[PDB]
Symmetry: C5
Subunit: 47 residues, 5 copies
């Protein structure tokens, strides 16, 4: 329901591990931005 | 209570997760600076 | 299972500590990429 | 009594949370450098 | 044993906290590199 890791790449992409899955995307623009709903799934487990 | 994550973007802005919410702001320069009060709330839950 | 540390170097390489071993590699861009099966093992224990 | 967070800004300034307080300074130069004694206190609580 | 923190400075140098002491060094490029044995001790305790 939260993140295990949450961190930036050098180009300013936000990375996060949520429910053992790896996600990336531009950081949220405002508090109504549903970041997890639009982040790119780049890893399907094991993180 | 405290922060679960506290980290920089490569652009120099400080980010923090506090009570499952996501905040960003220029880092504080003195302890007279209540950072959490002037930080931009960019995530209302789920972090 | 999963990582204990997961973080970028400033040149864009992803690093991870997994089962006390250190791994590095380009970050995944697809969840078809089994990152840990192709990451370079750079530390065999003690991490 | 140790740090809870310890991390770099993009210009190379070290940040640390110690006893719920936020500190910053140039990173320690050597083991004779008492970093915590010379670091700037930039946050007096809540970290 | 192991690391409490393990992170990069923006100049590419790897930092690690091991048994309350702070180390820095160029990151390992193979698992034959005993990183901790060659790392520079930059803090003798309190991390
Ligand atoms: C930690 C790691 O490398 N996890 C990957 C996962 O991201 C990926 O989706 C899957 C594809 O089969 O392989 C591995 O499980
Ligand atoms: C992890 C994540 O994406 N959290 C967001 C939250 O920050 C945002 O306030 C909310 C608005 O709909 O959507 C999601 O819950
Ligand atoms: C924390 C650390 O420096 N670990 C290294 C390990 O990565 C490496 O495989 C081994 C080489 O013999 O030496 C050390 O144990
Ligand atoms: C988490 C946070 O923003 N803490 C700050 C603290 O650093 C600062 O010294 C104080 C000033 O009144 O305000 C807040 O408590
Ligand atoms: C957290 C911190 O600043 N630790 C330092 C330690 O690294 C250093 O070796 C010593 C020098 O006397 O002073 C402090 O204990």
């Amino acid at each position: 329901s939260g993140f295990k890791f949450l961190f930036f790449s050098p180009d300013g992409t936000l990375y996060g591990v949520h429910n053992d899955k790896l996600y990336k995307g531009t950081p949220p623009t405002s508090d109504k931005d549903n970041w997890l709903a639009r982040a790119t799934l780049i890893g399907n487990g094991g993180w």
